[PDB]
Design a protein around this ligand. Structure first.
Ligand SMILES: NC(=O)C1=CN([C@@H]2O[C@H](COP(=O)(O)OP(=O)(O)OC[C@H]3O[C@@H](n4cnc5c(N)ncnc54)[C@H](OP(=O)(O)O)[C@@H]3O)[C@@H](O)[C@H]2O)C=CC1
Ligand SMILES: NC(=O)C1=CN([C@@H]2O[C@H](COP(=O)(O)OP(=O)(O)OC[C@H]3O[C@@H](n4cnc5c(N)ncnc54)[C@H](OP(=O)(O)O)[C@@H]3O)[C@@H](O)[C@H]2O)C=CC1
Lengths: 478, 478
């Protein structure tokens, strides 16, 4: 008899089984292809553990070995595979047993699974996993959301394998009812989507100045020593630049510029649009990936028009990390992460009102500190910012001093990138527009477009002096 | 007995009845509030065609007075109102009767509504109308899509009341099966969304230079005389700017900068994201409207942060249309509509592949020339561009000479606006990122982010030198 069950021996599924088994819990593993299950026990037999790891080839034996109430963890591809696995388990579980879906699924679908499963005496919990392969093996951050009773039942198992923060608290906190955990996980990736693109966009800017791959990460390493931008994404960005093939060439040169995506980044952008929360940086991150996927279109576009005006190339004479071009981008990069995280948090607060999770916002920022993708220094002030003022109008209001210090310095270098080079900067320029619009009392295009709609649609417009709607009568124009 | 029925006596519904009545067809009208139906006949009883206008207070009398097979046109609010009307019509029509939904609905629901009505012997058609209040009465453009058999019954009515182009063709063409007609209408507004924001953004740019409300439309009038930007949307922009109250103050000063939205702009951005077509300008137009709706956020943000660095103000001493800033902005504006229209058609072509509309694209662009919101000179070359090369990779490839002429001039003026002023330019700058990205064979941020995903997620990456996917072995970073 085992204590827990994990289904899906993928990158996240395989390492998670190793983690809990190392914790002393008896882990039962199952995968759709039984060959993987046999190989899993074969390679991981020389460890100081895995006597608790017993693999099974049939589903009936997988369920029967679990302590009642059963706790089955699902780590398969989100969507059809998760739906396929849950219905397969419905014939091998009993009343009161707990199923846990940990794949990066949609929170809308998460509530549907809860209703369909509670009708047959089954219990469901929706939680998200972040940290990647290494985070899975060492310790990830957990984002659980659903019925509060189920979370406490699996609380000891989750916290043991969870990442341990600097202070000592495990990086897991209950988020709320429904798909609150997956909603947080969905927007956890949304923040990851933008910042990962921000680092890549700054990578393009440095390359636009003739910086070869080595000095680009040299600039990044100096920014890490500053401490403000110290983050896991900075670590992987530096590692990507330093990557070199066996032939001596940089790895980044041979990599095709096509970025795959799986759901979570896309779904969060649509929902933010649907709820009405302005998230240009979050939406632009997804669109930027879509641009890279149309590689055949780009090749045809360049071939059909090769005389593209790319602007006057402006190589930077100083290629050291102390160069003004490097220094200006540091303030440009930092404010874009601040802007992007603000939009990520802005949707989450509005999402809490609409779907009624009962989200504990200050603790959810604190659960990012270690083990997850968004881990870094910036989570300190951001957790503190919403702890001091839970009613903060915008996350940037906590970082006023950093904005004043480098908002101007940010503006010229992007303009310098714009005028001198033809490098696309979708997310960074979206963030700058978000900062300006959210900090200007009156946006002139808001007034004019309101009039424009009234001209043809007679939709009316709002007035500043008095409440209500008024429509001025326009002359015929067709 | 009448031949056609119009349901919904709104701004669009009333004028469409006037159009068809002028054409000689007997129009039967019905509105949910019968007071509107009774009032409608009172003011339009002195017209030369008020014998053709017969109002009905009950739907049963409304249906019984229609020529068999019945053709009822629905022009009510999209969503719940249309669903209520459709179910109400199911009890008063018989087999072979045709229902036409003309509200700006979702094309996904349009195919679903057709299936639900064929199960009771009813026939459905999804069509969109654009042109506003004035366009509806003097002839709008129609975008019908659905069962091809249904189209022929309503062909004489739609083409007769349609706008007449310069050559003479009515601005109506069958688009395809399912919700193809409403899908064109949904992205018709998406193109309208961006350019309306582009004009408002150019209004912001000129206002940031001290041009004041009056001289801004004077600059706009010069661009109208140029002929390149000559369009209905340009005409209403000048009219909106020129609007002045009796007290002498500009109308734009008293208008609250909050922009409402009704479905089509939001839905098109989500669908473009869903299918994977990169349309940042279309998405940014919706996002820009969301920014203007957050009035409470900006007011609180400005109070919580009054020391906003607005940059070095650079007033243009020359406020004439011949000013270099105005001339550069003309080239900056023009290429962004070119970019935005390309994405609108790029989404439409990919949407045709996914849903199998069978879209006749060159004729679908040809229905835009007159009667719709986006009508103007620029639609001419675009119709010709896709006629010469139906497999054209991107509409920007057709406008090579205009791109070469002012792509650089567009880049500098945006940089001047960025450095000197803190005015948000979401849509225009999003288009510039689209222009740059679509014409570079290899995007460096696409390469770097591809490595970033492999570092933590082990997702792999594609290589330029050889086919396949590779995963580089990374050192521990947690
Ligand atoms: C996150 O966690 C979940 C699992 O990630 P990952 O470890 O990469 O596995 P994958 O997302 O690549 O899915 C692999 C698992 O699902 C099934 C497969 O069966 P089999 O391989 O035997 O065919 C295998 O067990 C995903 O939803 C991701 O978004
Ligand atoms: N965005 C654009 O560019 C364009 C928009 N359109 C679309 O055409 C359609 C009609 O536009 P418009 O003329 O302005 O009218 P409205 O969209 O303002 O809707 C008014 C009509 O809908 C009726 N109706 C309204 N609400 C309900 C409800 N819950 N239940 C049942 N019936 C209801 C109203 O009845 P009553 O008033 O008696 O209560 C009235 O007849 C819209 O969908 C619009 O999106 C058309 C052209 C251009």
């Amino acid at each position: 008899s085992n204590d827990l069950g994990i289904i899906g021996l993928g990158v996240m599924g395989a390492n998670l089984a190793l983690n809990i088994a190392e914790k002393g819990f008896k882990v039962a593993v199952f995968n759709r292809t039984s060959a993987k299950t046999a190989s899993f026990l074969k390679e991981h037999e020389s460890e100081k553990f895995a006597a608790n790891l017993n693999g099974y080839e049939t589903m009936k034996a997988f369920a029967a070995s679990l302590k009642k109430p059963r706790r089955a963890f699902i780590l398969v591809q989100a969507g059809a595979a998760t739906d396929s696995t849950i219905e397969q388990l419905k014939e091998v579980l009993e009343n009161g047993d707990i199923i846990i879906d940990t794949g990066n699924a949609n929170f809308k679908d998460q509530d549907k699974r809860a209703a369909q499963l509670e009708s047959q005496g089954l219990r469901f919990l929706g939680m998200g996993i972040s940290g990647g392969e290494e985070g899975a093996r060492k310790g990830p951050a957990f984002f659980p959301g659903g019925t509060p009773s189920v979370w406490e039942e699996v609380r000891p198992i989750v916290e043991a394998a969870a990442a341990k923060a600097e202070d000592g608290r495990p990086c897991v906190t209950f988020n709320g009812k429904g798909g609150a955990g997956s909603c947080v996980k969905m927007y956890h990736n949304a923040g990851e989507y933008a910042v990962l693109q921000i680092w890549g966009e700054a990578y393009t800017a440095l390359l636009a100045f003739g910086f070869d791959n080595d000095q680009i990460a040299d600039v990044f390493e100096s920014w890490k020593a500053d401490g403000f931008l110290k983050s896991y994404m900075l670590d992987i960005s530096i590692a990507a630049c330093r990557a070199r093939e066996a032939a001596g060439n940089y790895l980044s040169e041979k990599v095709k510029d096509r970025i795959g995506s799986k759901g979570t980044g896309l779904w969060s952008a649509q929902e933010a649009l649907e709820v009405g929360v302005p998230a240009p940086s979050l939406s632009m991150a997804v669109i930027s990936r879509q641009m890279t996927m149309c590689k055949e279109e780009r090749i045809a576009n360049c071939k059909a028009f090769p005389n593209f005006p790319r602007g006057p190339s402006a190589e930077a004479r100083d290629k050291s990390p102390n160069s003004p071009d490097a220094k200006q981008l540091y303030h440009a990069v930092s404010l874009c992460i601040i802007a992007s995280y603000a939009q990520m948090f802005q949707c989450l607060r509005e999402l809490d009102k609409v779907y009624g999770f009962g989200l504990n916002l200050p603790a959810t920022i604190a659960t990012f500190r270690a083990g997850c993708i968004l881990q870094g220094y910036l989570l300190g002030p951001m957790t503190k910012a919403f702890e001091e003022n839970p009613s903060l109008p915008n996350l940037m209001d906590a970082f006023t001093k950093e904005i004043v210090a480098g908002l101007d310095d940010c503006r010229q270098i992007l303009a310098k990138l714009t005028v001198n080079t033809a490098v696309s900067l979708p997310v960074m320029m979206a963030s700058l527009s978000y900062i300006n619009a959210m900090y200007t009392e009156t946006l002139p295009y808001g007034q004019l477009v309101s009039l424009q709609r009234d001209v043809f649609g007679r939709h009316g417009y709002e007035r500043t002096d008095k409440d209500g709607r008024e429509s001025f009568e326009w002359p015929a124009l067709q």
